[PDB]
Ligand binder design. Structure first.
Ligand SMILES: CC(=O)N[C@@H]1[C@@H](O)[C@H](O)[C@@H](CO)O[C@H]1O
Ligand SMILES: CC(=O)N[C@@H]1[C@@H](O)[C@H](O)[C@@H](CO)O[C@H]1O
Ligand SMILES: CC(=O)N[C@@H]1[C@@H](O)[C@H](O)[C@@H](CO)O[C@H]1O
Ligand SMILES: [Cu+2]
Ligand SMILES: [Cu+2]
Ligand SMILES: [Cu+2]
Ligand SMILES: [Cu+2]
Ligand SMILES: [Cu+2]
Ligand SMILES: [Cu+2]
Ligand SMILES: [Cu+2]
Lengths: 408, 408, 408, 408
């Protein structure tokens, strides 16, 4: 990078860059050290250790369902970087930008073997699996849905684009968050699938190697939002919202030794001061941009989205239990529904209670125009949460959604 | 007039006017028909009449914590106003402005003896109380806060003013309601105080005649907003918010006979169609202002409110149980606090569940500062919610209040 | 043992008569013996002593949800009757008919105390409640809908009438026990309202005496149907239906000593062997007429109904595990629903799962008509399930009601 | 588009005719388009594309176990027929009638190869199997019971005859689809015997063409019933039954583009709108007679049956998740059982759970008679369930069969 470690597409890496990361985590993996892989995992969920790392009832950590979410996870990736160079990660933990239709799957983390046979090495792509220690099983993803190589009625017109872009449109940090965070979940799910020990499970994603690679990109999106904020005229590290959490540290990052042998994360635990990453954490992205759209190109695209009447459904997420996913559709008066959109929440047991202080908006303008329906009409919205396993979830007490309207 | 009634303050009510009114409800109070007083009372709460009078588990029947709240309560006064009409009234249901500091509690409804001219009579003040029949009980009032009688750092800048005015600084209807309603909640308590049977108890609170009086000033100022919105450029009769509910016919009004003999309110159960009062209900307010400044002077006021940094506490109101009061204090790092502010909610144990889909912000600016406190100063915030009875209710699971900051 | 008995209405009871029964159960209720009250109480459901009385997992021995229900409960009133006799009774167990709107609560079972009145002295009305020793608890009551009195959109046609009359229409023993049972569910509800230890709970209900009182009026209908059929041309005592189970001994009446010291009760445990009560069980009814109408008049009243197009909703009952109650409305394409009817089951932790082999029908012609609708027009139809202890039951997994059309 | 079609028997087919269809499907089977074979194949069950085609948990879109089954499969033969036409076909999809003992296997679908024979040349018989691309597998067959040929304790009365004849007796649309479906189950079994990828599996079966062939002979009976009824006095196109679902659009035929490029198919997705095939779907049958017997002769043959006491067993089907087959005998009190009958369902991992709202009946008079037994005598009745892949299915939890008696 500048010195700043540069985080890049796990895709356009160097045979060398790659190699380094391979040996790196390979080592990292059997680093029984407090700041060794396997204990880092114990941060995000199981074994939990948050109220304290051993007090009464152990809630797991990882600010999920709250504002101070990205800050937490931001420390975590770095907590993994300032962890790879411990093993000579010649570079910064690369990102797997799911935001774009990926036909073939990135080989960096799909291969189960790796012939360093040119050099002296020939085995498993450590960046393709790990072993859950205490819970003695194997993270084994079930991508199941490789329709993460899907839609785009216009090509780039895909889920994540719609998701992030909107997220990005938000100017109030907190508005941006709920949305930003829901896209996070997508990939948690799109990979863990219907399996237990995997990326689709609060308690276990940490264990899988791709975790880093994804949050690396989510935190790359986060960055992308700061940068756009700056371009809009706002201080990108200014959070005037939720100023009750930002000051409160961030466990265990704040725990110090001997659970976190890092000092920067430690010193930088109060989210408040974790926004401007480049300073406190020297690392950066090669291209703060979304799907080859310049920061000015993004802004600009957004304001063109604003050029017309739009229609959204609001979601009051209170989420609890295991992570689940939900579909919703626009039923017409005699009952003519159309799949309108979907989203998923990550979660488990030890999750720490959470309820968004606000709605999760989700555009439906299109599905509506298609079906010849306007905001002046009678149409009802219908949902069905569903567990990470064929278990229909009662959509009863679950507050019905609003149906916002954003003119101009 | 032909196709309108006019609403004045109880305090500008010429004996002429109030005479009509005294004999009106008096007659009303004796109307045993489905659109006579007693009847026209449960429409609110007890006895339950809402899923359907015939249903098994029955809830209240009035929209609370919900964007359609004002329209319902607005539709309700029309219901009363129309009965008085049917009973020799010649004026609209007067509003008891509680905005301005009350020197004493108005005559119209305070004394309990209507003597006066023409008939040379001498009998009870119908507008001073009725009595709950089904319950064999009788209405009550307990103004344990009459110190509601003028507080105000700089004079006319009083609580409910502070309150109702913020609310007006808001063009996102839902945003304004979640504030416009908490305001309204105050009198509900300022009057019933602690009487299990009174303006302070979701259930019987519709039987005391102030209900109407009060709910007329609210309806008043709500009309105000509309007006104000006009002066801001927006369509004062369009709500591009919560449309999923702005369309569900408001019961009982949507019941028609034999529960609701009034036609122009079935014809209007849809909130959607309750915004245009003068026109669908033909009833006007004498004036449209709030404590002095006109619609304009209003707009030309709030702005000033926006010329300085402000600091709010947001409250995530899931509300449920019985009516109850919450007060909150800012606590300095050390251990001492200062009374922050306080709001209250009205709520029977016969209410349909309800949780707001947005935070309920309230200003702690000054207080904070008058405590040598900066928006960026390490400080906590403890809350207290006690019933109307006096059981301290454990907030152990009440979501901690945020601490929003505000630019400009 | 020797002598017939004539069961009378719980109103045309002569103080001599009443006296014999008052003193009888009084004695019964102190009969510690296996054929004593607290014990005969057990036969229905709790303490369960079912497949056997000693095996690991046990259930409430009573038949519910199955074809063979009316026999089980028939043997049971006999079991109790013979027992009342054994203690001095000399009249059959009276029946509290409720197809007729009760304007008050029959003395027999309501007085808190009774007066020998044939020697004058005070004792508590044994037919007014009882203890429940194993549970160390006491029955209780709650006449919930004493609004049962409240009935008759056109006179005597009360819910139960419509309800039983229909059951009497069906000429197939099976198609009819569907209705006849679901009818025998109402009093259960209307006497135990929300109280856990009462009639509304499979477990304790047979602990309260009004059960005997009820199930005597049901068996009164069962005999009556037996007339309507004989009058119709059929041999009462045989059924062209369900023969798979009409011969499986009923428990525990079959056990014999030591859980059933009664021999007629046992020897006649096979339901087929109990259709001709008087012959097997010496006992008859003062009268067999619903609303005082002849078996002939019934056969007339029915066909007369067989004269218009009707319309019914279809219910596939299965039974939760707790007594519940659902009422279904019948919303228009508009979104304006309209209460149309209801029924309730009698569930219980300790039951043996059951589902009726056919649908339970329930006419909606009328409600339809009074809404400008008919079988060809478009209408939807909604349900809402509630537990006895106010607790909405998820109806998500509840096969939707079908809507029939019956010509003639 | 324009022109009627007459569906013929798969035997009285003229080489010209056959030719048009042979070349047609041949073409069809190479139609990669949404309305191509491999795709139209999907409509039934696998690949599932059901509630919607993109939501998380998906099911086989086909209706089974429900009232609305005969329409679904009716729209489906049309969906395929129009498609055969689109490729050159000019005759309706023939029907392989099997109510009549097939002594051989009809050429149409059996020759491994065919000879243009109207220009002479070899091509493979497209109506003889197909590939199944998604599964990367190929249909297969196993005529298991080519012992189907084997039938007739007294001639033409083959299992299917007894079976269908009965379905035609019932005059209630619903009571009859119970039989009519369970009948449409036999060929499924008798063609796919033990082979996983064949007709005996909900998933793949519509992949083999003889399905079309079958479901054309079923729809042939469905029309026939429609005669017997019209002849009986009823309006074919309406049903006095199940109206709750006769108007719920069938999937995916309703979807439209891009999963159903057919418009008649969609526009007529509501089952009510499909009873009068010829009118909606241009197409008829050469004949409508079971065993060559007139609609009149049927109405005669039936009543004639309505002339003796019969006896039936009762089955409450629910459906496992896999196609199964059970056969019930009817053991004496002796311990000497006697095969009495059987039937089989068509299950599948991917189904939408269903249970019939009523029992499925199946007569045992005869077997009873030939054993010196009748409805009053004592006899028990046993079942044995086996999977297609030899695997005894636990019948422990399977509501026992009831045994009816039908006089007249
Ligand atoms: C995976 C691979 O490249 N194949 C090699 C194989 O050619 C070789 O015979 C062997 C020596 O034991 O190691 C294998 O498994
Ligand atoms: C059996 C074993 O150790 N696995 C080897 C692996 O090391 C090597 O990378 C691969 C290609 O040479 O050949 C496999 O057979
Ligand atoms: C003369 C009279 O009765 N009318 C009074 C008036 O003097 C007073 O100014 C007004 C409030 O400003 O209230 C009216 O009722
Ligand atoms: Cu996380
Ligand atoms: Cu209210
Ligand atoms: Cu109110
Ligand atoms: Cu019972
Ligand atoms: Cu005496
Ligand atoms: Cu099928
Ligand atoms: Cu030739």
């Amino acid at each position: 990078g500048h010195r700043n470690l540069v985080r890049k597409s796990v895709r356009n890496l160097s045979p060398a860059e790659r190699a380094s990361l391979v040996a790196a985590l390979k080592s990292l993996q059997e680093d029984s050290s407090a700041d060794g892989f396997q204990s880092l995992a114990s941060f995000h969920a199981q074994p939990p250790l948050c109220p304290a790392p051993a007090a009464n009832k152990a809630f797991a950590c990882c600010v999920h369902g709250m504002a101070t979410f990205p800050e937490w996870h931001r420390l975590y990736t770095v907590q993994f970087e300032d962890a790879l160079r411990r093993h000579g990660s010649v570079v910064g933990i690369p990102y797997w930008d799911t935001v774009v239709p990926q036909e073939d799957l990135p080989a960096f983390f799909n291969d189960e073997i790796w012939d360093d046979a040119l050099f002296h090495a020939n085995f498993t792509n450590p960046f393709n699996g790990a072993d859950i220690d205490f819970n003695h099983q194997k993270i084994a993803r079930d991508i199941n849905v490789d329709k993460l190589a899907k839609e785009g009625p216009k090509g780039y017109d895909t889920w994540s684009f719609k998701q992030y872009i909107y997220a990005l449109e938000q100017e109030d940090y907190c508005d941006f968050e709920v949305q930003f965070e829901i896209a996070h979940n997508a990939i948690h799910a799109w990979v863990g699938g219907t399996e237990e020990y995997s990326m689709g499970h609060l308690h276990y994603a940490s264990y899988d190697p791709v975790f880093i690679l994804h949050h690396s990109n989510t935190d790359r999106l986060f960055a992308l939002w700061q940068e756009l904020q700056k371009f809009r005229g706002h201080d990108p590290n200014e959070v005037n919202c939720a100023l009750e959490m930002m000051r409160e540290p961030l466990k265990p990052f704040s725990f110090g030794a001997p659970y976190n042998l890092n000092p920067t994360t430690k010193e930088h635990s109060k989210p408040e001061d974790t926004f401007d990453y480049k300073g406190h954490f020297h690392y950066e992205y090669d291209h703060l941009e979304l799907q080859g759209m310049n920061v000015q190109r993004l802004h600009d695209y957004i304001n063109q989205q604003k050029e017309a009447d739009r229609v959204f459904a609001g979601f009051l997420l209170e989420g609890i239990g295991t992570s689940a996913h939900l579909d919703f559709s626009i039923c017409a008066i005699d009952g003519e529904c159309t799949h309108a959109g979907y989203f998923d929440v990550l979660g488990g047991s030890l999750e720490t209670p959470w309820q968004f202080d606000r709605l999760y908006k989700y555009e439906i303008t299109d599905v509506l125009e298609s079906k010849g329906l306007d905001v002046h009409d009678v149409f009802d919205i219908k949902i069905t949460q569903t567990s990470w396993d064929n278990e229909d979830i009662s959509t009863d007490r679950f507050p019905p959604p609003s149906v916002i309207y954003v003119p101009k």
